[PDB]
Amino acid sequence: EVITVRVQDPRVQNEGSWNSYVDYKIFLHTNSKAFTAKTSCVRRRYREFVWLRKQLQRNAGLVPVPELPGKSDEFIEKRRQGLQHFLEKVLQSVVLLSDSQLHLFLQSQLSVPEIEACVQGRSTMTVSDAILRYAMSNLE
Amino acid sequence: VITVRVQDPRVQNEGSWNSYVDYKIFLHTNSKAFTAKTSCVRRRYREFVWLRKQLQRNAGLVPVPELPGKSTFFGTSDEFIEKRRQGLQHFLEKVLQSVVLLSDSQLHLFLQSQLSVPEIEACV
């Protein structure tokens, strides 16, 4: 199985107005049975990556999570490479690769809050066949 | 081409009385203009029950696929969840092939909005 991730095409959304910001296109080309989309295209702010790293650190327990680049056109390009490097490294850690929140971040044009939603409460397997039976009987 | 999978059953509100199970609906489409459109929403079974009744109203005389009830089932818990999960996916797969049902706005909100049922009844 082969996974390719490039971070291309930096663009300034909302030119000149105060909520001006830069997002980056994340092109994920896979043929891996781990992922769903075999080519995928999503735009992500830097602040979204900052969230993603904090989220990877929770689920990864004690597995090291690659660093992000801290702190125009030259800086944008330095960060662009840094973001690509970060994802390249993340996709090589098999534990991190299995994070559902990462899978939604990379493939899914969901917001961060929408990803935090699509992931809630324990699965119906990682729970006592008693809590699951209590769940199954609910009402109006 | 439109693809729908119903995956990742989960228990929201573990142990407390308003404990319940919802299912992730992954709707993956492509126009050849773009690359891949996705979409991810969690839905209770009772939400599907509503959706079917709503599809039947607007569909006039077009047959609406069946949902999985509780029938002759001897299995484990985890087994029932998985039987229902397939049943729900089957139901949506069938619904998405009926061109009339596919054009229901309430279905489009159910599959692609993170709106409540009452919020969908409002938006319409």
Swiss-Prot record, chain A:
Region (Important for membrane trafficking): 115-119
Gene Ontology CC: cytoplasm; endosome; plasma membrane
Domain of life: Eukaryota
GO biological process entries: intracellular protein transport; vesicle organization
Localisation: Cell membrane; Endosome; Cytoplasm
GO terms for MF: phosphatidylinositol phosphate binding
Reported function: Phosphoinositide-binding protein involved in protein sorting and membrane trafficking in endosomes. Regulates the levels of TRPV3 by promoting its trafficking from the cell membrane to lysosome for degradation.
Domain notes per entry: The PX domain mediates interaction with membranes enriched in phosphatidylinositol 3-phosphate.
Assembly with partners or alone: Monomer. Interacts with TRPV3; this interaction promotes TRPV3 trafficking from the cell membrane to lysosome for degradation.
Similarity annotation: Belongs to the sorting nexin family.
Protein name: Sorting nexin-11
Organism the protein comes from: Homo sapiens (Human)
Residues of the full protein shown: 15 to 158 of 270
